[PDB]
Amino acid sequence: SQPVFASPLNVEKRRLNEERALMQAQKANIQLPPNYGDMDLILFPEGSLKNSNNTVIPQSHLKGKSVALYFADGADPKCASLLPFLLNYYRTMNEGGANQKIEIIFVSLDRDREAFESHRAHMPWLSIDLENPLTEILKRHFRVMKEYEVPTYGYGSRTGVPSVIVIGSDGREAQFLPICSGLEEGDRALLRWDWRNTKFA
Amino acid sequence: SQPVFASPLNVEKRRLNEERALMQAQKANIQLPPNYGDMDLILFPEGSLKNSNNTVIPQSHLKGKSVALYFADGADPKCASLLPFLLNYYRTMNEGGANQKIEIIFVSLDRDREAFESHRAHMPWLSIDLENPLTEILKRHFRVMKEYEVPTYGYGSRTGVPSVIVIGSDGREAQFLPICSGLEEGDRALLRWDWRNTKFA
Amino acid sequence: AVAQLLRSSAE
Amino acid sequence: MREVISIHVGQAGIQIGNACWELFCLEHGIQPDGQMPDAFNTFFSETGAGKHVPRCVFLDLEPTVVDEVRTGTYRHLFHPEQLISGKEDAANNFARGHYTIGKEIVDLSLDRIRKLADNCTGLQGFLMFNAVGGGTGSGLGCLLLERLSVDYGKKSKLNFCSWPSPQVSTAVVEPYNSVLSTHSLLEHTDVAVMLDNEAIYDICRRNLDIERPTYTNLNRLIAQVISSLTASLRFDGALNVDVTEFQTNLVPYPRIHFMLSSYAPIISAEKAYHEQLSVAEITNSAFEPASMMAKCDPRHGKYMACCLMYRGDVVPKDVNAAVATIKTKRTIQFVDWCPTGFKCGINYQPPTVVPGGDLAKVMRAVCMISNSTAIAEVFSRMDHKFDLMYAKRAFVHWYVGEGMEEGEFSEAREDLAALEKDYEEVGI
Amino acid sequence: CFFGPDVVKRTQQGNYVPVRPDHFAGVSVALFFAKAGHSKCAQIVPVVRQFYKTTNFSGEKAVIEIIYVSLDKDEQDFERVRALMPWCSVEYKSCLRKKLIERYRVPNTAIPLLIVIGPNGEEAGRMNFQQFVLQRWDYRFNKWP
Amino acid sequence: MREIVHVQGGQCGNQIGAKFWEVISDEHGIDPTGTYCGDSDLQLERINVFYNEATGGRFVPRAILMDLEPGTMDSVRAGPFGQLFRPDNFVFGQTGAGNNWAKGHYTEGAELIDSVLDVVRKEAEGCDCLQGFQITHSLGGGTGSGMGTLLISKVREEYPDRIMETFSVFPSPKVSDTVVEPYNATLSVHQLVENADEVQVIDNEALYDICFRTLKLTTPTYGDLNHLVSAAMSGVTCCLRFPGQLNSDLRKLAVNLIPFPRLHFFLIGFAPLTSRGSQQYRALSVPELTQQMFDAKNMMCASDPRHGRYLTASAMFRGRMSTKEVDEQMLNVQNKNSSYFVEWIPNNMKSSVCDIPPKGLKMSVTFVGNSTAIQEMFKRVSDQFTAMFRRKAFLHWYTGEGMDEMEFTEAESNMNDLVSEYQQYQ
Ligand SMILES: Nc1nc2c(ncn2[C@@H]2O[C@H](COP(=O)(O)OP(=O)(O)OP(=O)(O)O)[C@@H](O)[C@H]2O)c(=O)[nH]1
Ligand SMILES: Nc1nc2c(ncn2[C@@H]2O[C@H](COP(=O)(O)OP(=O)(O)O)[C@@H](O)[C@H]2O)c(=O)[nH]1
Ligand SMILES: [Mg+2]
Structure with missing residues (x-):
């Protein structure tokens, strides 16, 4: 039920968890509907993550790191402003330490493949391909949207483009970095990112 | 029998349970016609219920949750005023907790399919599609109508659109939240929902 | 109206 | 069984109490539903199977800030007529807020306080969070305090009033509100704690480097102060001081109870990544004059009694070592008739950080509540501001046409000037 | 495993071979970024080539090793210059070369260039050639375990 | 909850509130047919202040449309959002006060004012307790300044303690129509200075001036000007309908702007106002709205504020902003322009932060300033009125249908005492 309840991740997760719980119920006093703690979901499938060279990076590769979704658009000038700062921060953090500890997964707000690839051509970090359902499914998960077109349920838009949000293994916001929020500390709030307590378990 | 004897859902209930009772009596001390405490019903067929992701959701998934039917119409200004309050009540109810507590199944009084889809895009809980006769048998079972176009069988009228009916396992009217009734508590009647004891079993 | 297009403008 | 009752009057106190109660929920591990999946008893009651309602009442004459709570996330945390x-x-x-519209609901406020305070003996005290610059904060607060003194005579009463700042106001009439409030809460409280909005603004500007914070960022800092305050009534410590012991070791005379606040460390997540939070550091920063939560310089004040509320993995042996350092530091003065003026308190539970907030995860913290002569200047600016406005009858027709008589301004003025006389004779 | 698969090519005439994974023990490693058809590369290649032979095959233990990474635009051109460079190279179709260039910030006039590297894989010495300077780097610097 | 009953006096006030209810319905998600669209709780938890449930689910405004000629009234009904008003809330007039104060107030507004107190008391008593009334009327005419001011009197003997807010337009300084402007202006002032809790002054030459060098509109219509007034007119009553970090109702403005009961006239401005070529070229945060509301080039009254001195002021912010850079920047405009603020009142000005901006905008503000600089507007009506009166000109068009001479002397004496109570603080 986190972050919201009217998200397709949450509906899909609810369905599969109560299917498996009912499977153990007919197999066997078990509590239902299942608790959000025992409630589990695989968030990224096998063929969902691609790097700059379009090679499959598996879900288990992200073990032991702090992952952040970069809800981003190639045509937004504020996004084009934030992209060099994020690129600098990612390079210097992955290059300061022995292992690499932070990860950026790019979530597209574009409209076509040409603009998508022209925005992909500058990024070293990983991405989610555009005609996957998963990008709009995570879009309605995190309530990030250009301008209100889809009916979101009660809540308005959490944030506008650009945004970076660090991600748990359950899809919860471990921390919302304030680019366009009530703090309005744009193009600097990457410094507020903490990775010692945000771990992709 | 309960809530009203001359309802289509109740009479099909009674016909099916006397079928099974006469069948097992001929196969075999039994009592005929079968009792209201012994009579059994499946309330939604396999492909009836339907979530926001347009995936089919089974009935047995809903036990352990206080589930209620929302009889609503898109052009009704009552339903227009009621929809955000119902959205917020559902959303607070299913965010502030450890498991899912309440559920709504939508029954429509809409004019046509485009209106049905435009209204269904504004609600995230389950719904029953308009051409399915489950909508009309539920309307005749729970005495909900805009205007007199089905003969009410020596009835009056329980309630007009909009309505919320907290349901039990066998089609029992558990309690009625008094929005448009003799109590006339518009949108404050949602707070009377007794989800602790009205449980789908 | 032009006042409608100025005051409530977003684009 | 110890228990404290929270009172939140005014929309400043409602929003302060919103951050105050989500911190209490997180540290005791209750969901907004109200039941976990007996050290919590001082803030939460028992409600049948597992549930917990807060021991608080929310009073405000404006319906929007309270209806926001009734429609928000914590709509089934609070009992519906708290x-x-x-x-x-x-x-x-x-x-x-004192004479016409305050009296049709103060009867209900006392009826509900009667309803929840007689459930157990061993009531420990009352906390009150109000705004002295507003109308319903200082008006309905004054009727509530005078009726609290009449019924609950000997009970401890703590105050956390948002005093108006020297430079920033967000009101024009609040000098009149402050001088009538501080007159009548002098004889109706026991310990008064000064919280100033501009002081917390400078705290989050320098320490967390938050250049643009809202009220909900300031209310987390006040909430952490209350949590480390009543920590002794919730968690086992090496040596604890109850909140009834503050009015023994921090006030030398009944008329002198207005006193400051401080918290250290208050650091961001990347601040902790380059700093070790040694006890000597976090008690030095709590003594630093710019870390005060009242916006008054204590370098020209004169300390009388300081209480330090350590909270975390703090051994008592470097408690005495660290407090001996601030004895010998000549910049911090101490009054002559109080040679020892420190009553420490150590607790084992580390502070709880809210998710997605702005504070870091810390292993030890300091909640300093200190009585000093620096309260002279926090009322000397109300001395000037009330004098300028009342010199030619500014905004007076609103008060006197409401129903109060012309002369409460003068007697509240004279009680404040007498209070300044009482402070300056202490400091000689 | 850093480089990983066969992508580190050892030269061989008749058939094509990958150099084995732990070849690099006790040797000092320099990435040589070059591009064919460049006027400057045309003189940087023979100087570092003569240096490669002279330094490496005086001592009985191999002391230096040079990994060739190229900014070519043509796979046949890459092949005919890999057949001209006598040291280790990388595959054209492999994306490890793109990873190395994008990590090490090689623009598409700084070309050609040397980056001598350490055992974990980070920068240990940067050497441009934009204008006797090649003798600056020493083989006994990056003694690898 | 609180309710604000709207009054539409004069044909200018009819069109001003016609666009006002267009704005309020736009931000509350109200269809012109009365249904709700917008599926959000925040538009509907406070909708009883301006709308009433009508057992059809539709929301009728709590507004009285009141005029002495039916031509402008049928224009409201035939236009958009004119389907929204209740038919019984229109109070038709047949003859019409011909820009004549005496016909509006004494002899021809008398037989209609009993019919409109019937519907004012019907809507007011329908709720348990309301906050106040807002009155939109014109002072250059006869129906507005004559008949609407008698409505201001009658609801004040009957409801004494409710907030009497009025949005009133005044005669324009430079060039004007309706040659008996100072006659209807001074006679409306000396009735309204003791019967109105707060007056918000609007000038049409100021509204014209806004559209030219800050909007670059070559052809502004009256629908353009009505939306200027309505933008700040809902900009005062934000916190009644929407939550905020620092709420403020109309009486919060009343108690915290006037130090003395007889001076309550407020210059009104709105921000941010950007043209088409400059919307995407301007940042939208706190520090540039606060310079905008402190300008002589945005104010919707033609009284230059830097000529006078700001006694007490207020700002109602809306939208998503941080309260700190709001907080010290009301200070920051106070201390750089210290000569423009009064000394014997410390920290002359109030803020109030609301969480809901107008649609399209992410953050806005409405400025309500009690400035001594309105003395130039009063003295301009003064020497225009005494120029006409000393030659007895146009006086038989008042004194011959129910009124006499000496209330003109009392009109200019009350207006001159209103003048003299201002420069003693300047
Ligand atoms: N720290 C803090 N101070 C607040 C907050 N909200 C308001 N204030 C302060 O309260 C002062 C005015 O009092 P208000 O809370 O606005 O109003 P009130 O005390 O409830 O009295 P009324 O205006 O009659 O409702 C302002 O000067 C603010 O400094 C808040 O959320 N946190
Ligand atoms: N701002 C504005 N002013 C108007 C509007 N209609 C008329 N006026 C002004 O009203 C003045 C005439 O007064 P009028 O309303 O006709 O008098 P009434 O018929 O007695 O109400 C003229 O100076 C116009 O400038 C309008 O829609 N908006
Ligand atoms: Mg107040």
């Missing part, structure tokens, strides 16, 4: 709401606000008027 949230008492009026119809019209007091509208920045001490008189109107």
